[PDB]
Design a protein around this ligand. Structure first.
Ligand SMILES: Cc1ncc(CNC(=O)c2cnc(CNS(=O)(=O)c3ccc(F)c(Cl)c3)cn2)s1
Ligand SMILES: N[C@@H](CCC(=O)O)C(=O)O
Lengths: 257, 277
């Protein structure tokens, strides 16, 4: 009876964000409204387009207002894309949204369309063993590392009292978006970026001045975000599982990642 | 209903079954029964009482504590993991479909056709379809031509799988010519396939990615390898198969997702899948 409201976030290679030409138009491109009509495309956009026929539904894409993924902070409320899905501003989160415990308590994740994990991005020439490096375990303002504010990696470092200090040094250096933190490593004032490997190593393959280290120190996956009552969950998960088997998700991984 | 009927299937290192003390199941093992026939004409049999352990067994225990439920454990005897034969499901999947088991625990691959009949939990063990050789290959993987069109060589490559699983079900739907070529190289089990590889009778073994990565890490001399240095086709995972509309679907995932963020899946990963090679 209505168009599905799709919330997305700027995160290459999954979702690119470009401005419309002077005509107002823009590979498969869909008009996305963000803080202004813009142009969005990439992994998660091709997957949304593949979902929209398999299920035969119309949609409208718009970027998240605050530019965040989603965490639960006390005033408890959800920010980022999580809050827009729970408040009604969104009917579906199509983005590299990480599946964890706290988010699943409120929303409904589909089966993971992307299996990956967490790694560390650094400027090529800087050497750290991994997540257990002494420059990260016992940190100092001589070696600056951080992650993205209001993200799943931020939740990961704060929900365990043992990682309380690795989190506090990041608590002062965290960035508003991944793109700011990645280029900050190139300008050599961010010494390490802890983010998902599906994004970090891919950008290390396009910018030969940064390198991912330590491989994966923790596994995580990406799933479609839906509310507890969305009557597409059964068919979204089946479409993702079918997309994994028919070698078609593998086509997107070679196309974008 | 606080006591559930749970089905499992032996496949190291996720579910390992050992004979019982000739009296109780000790150490890290859990009592699990197996219906064993008296003879091959009567339907009469007896529940022999064994002991089960492994990755998925401790996963069952952790969920048994957090979700607060008791259970009996029994090994599937009608098939293995599950296959739809004449529109009838067997194996562990069939045990949940026909309401003889509330949930299914083990190396149960999540694919699309099973989620039509059962409800799967969040994947807690990443897996898929991988290729194992031993050794000295340049093939890219399953999409490599030599698996697609075998007879374009003289001789063709000799590769097989263990049938009736999620691996053969995927290759049959995706590669009709490759599938009908693999039928002559079908192996009865994982142990027979490894022997065929090391004896030169088999060139490649296509099977579940998680099991192959485990067997490759415990090979004498580090000769068995998965190609792509661990590449996986049709990425998926093992999942607790529940009833369609099961009221236990709400904690198993929330508690499994808890086990991930807690740091407990890492323990059983380094407990059971620690590799020498
Ligand atoms: C061979 C082995 N793989 C995994 C093992 C231990 N469990 C995990 O790492 C794990 C991590 N996260 C989740 C939940 N999120 S998820 O997106 O559904 C997901 C992401 C990555 C994954 F690998 C799997 Cl399986 C599932 C579940 N499980 S042992
Ligand atoms: N894990 C598979 C069985 C082994 C395989 O087919 O690779 C399943 O649940 O069907």
């Amino acid at each position: 009876s209505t168009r599905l409201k799709i919330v997305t976030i700027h995160q290459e290679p999954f979702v690119y964000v470009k401005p419309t030409m002077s005509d107002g138009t823009c590979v498969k491109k869909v008009i996305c409204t963000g803080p202004v009509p813009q142009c969005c495309y990439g992994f998660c956009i091709d997957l949304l387009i593949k979902l929209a026929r398999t299920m035969n539904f119309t949609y409208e894409v718009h970027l998240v207002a605050d530019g965040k993924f989603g965490t639960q902070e006390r005033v408890k409320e959800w920010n980022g894309m999580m809050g827009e899905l729970l408040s009604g501003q969104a009917d579906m989160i199509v983005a590299p949204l990480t599946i964890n415990n706290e988010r699943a308590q409120y929303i409904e994740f589909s089966k993971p369309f992307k299996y990956q994990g967490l790694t560390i991005l650094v400027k090529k020439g800087t050497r750290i063993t991994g997540i257990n490096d002494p420059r990260l375990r016992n940190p100092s303002d001589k070696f600056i590392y951080a992650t993205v504010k209001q993200s799943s990696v931020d939740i990961y470092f704060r929900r365990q009292v043992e990682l309380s200090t690795m989190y506090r040094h990041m608590e002062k250096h965290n960035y508003e978006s991944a793109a700011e933190a990645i280029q900050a490593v190139r300008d050599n004032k961010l010494h390490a970026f802890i983010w998902d490997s599906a994004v970090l190593e891919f950008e290390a393959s396009q910018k030969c001045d940064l390198v991912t280290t330590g491989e994966l120190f923790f596994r995580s996956g990406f799933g479609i975000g839906m509310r507890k009552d969305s009557p597409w969950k059964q068919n979204v998960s089946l479409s993702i599982l079918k997309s994994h088997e028919n070698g078609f998700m593998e086509d997107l991984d070679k196309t974008w990642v | 209903d606080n006591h559930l009927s749970i089905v499992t299937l032996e496949e190291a290192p996720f579910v390992i079954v050992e004979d019982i003390d000739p009296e109780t199941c000790v150490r890290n093992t859990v009592p699990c029964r197996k219906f064993v026939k008296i003879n091959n004409s009567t339907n009469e049999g007896m529940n022999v009482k064994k002991c089960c352990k492994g990755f998925c067994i401790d996963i069952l225990k952790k969920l048994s504590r957090t979700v607060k439920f008791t259970y009996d454990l029994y090994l599937v005897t009608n098939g293995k993991h599950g296959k739809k034969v004449n529109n009838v499901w067997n194996g562990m999947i069939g045990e949940v479909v026909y309401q003889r088991a509330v949930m299914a625990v083990g190396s149960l691959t999540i694919n699309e056709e099973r989620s039509e009949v059962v409800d799967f939990s969040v994947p807690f063990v990443e897996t898929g379809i991988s290729v194992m050789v031993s050794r000295g290959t340049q093939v890219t993987g399953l999409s490599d031509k030599k698996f697609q069109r075998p007879h374009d060589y003289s001789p063709p490559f000799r590769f097989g799988t263990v049938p009736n699983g999620s691996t053969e079900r995927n290759i049959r739907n995706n590669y009709p010519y490759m599938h009908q070529y693999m039928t002559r190289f079908n192996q009865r089990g994982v142990e027979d396939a490894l022997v065929s590889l090391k004896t030169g009778k088999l060139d490649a073994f296509i099977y579940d990615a998680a099991v192959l990565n485990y067997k490759a890490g415990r090979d004498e001399g580090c000769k068995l390898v998965t190609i792509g240095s661990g590449y996986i086709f049709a990425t998926t995972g093992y999942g607790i198969a529940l009833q369609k509309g099961s009221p236990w679907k709400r904690q198993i995932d929330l508690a499994l997702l808890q086990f991930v963020g807690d740091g407990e899946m890492e323990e059983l990963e380094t407990l059971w899948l620690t590799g020498i090679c």
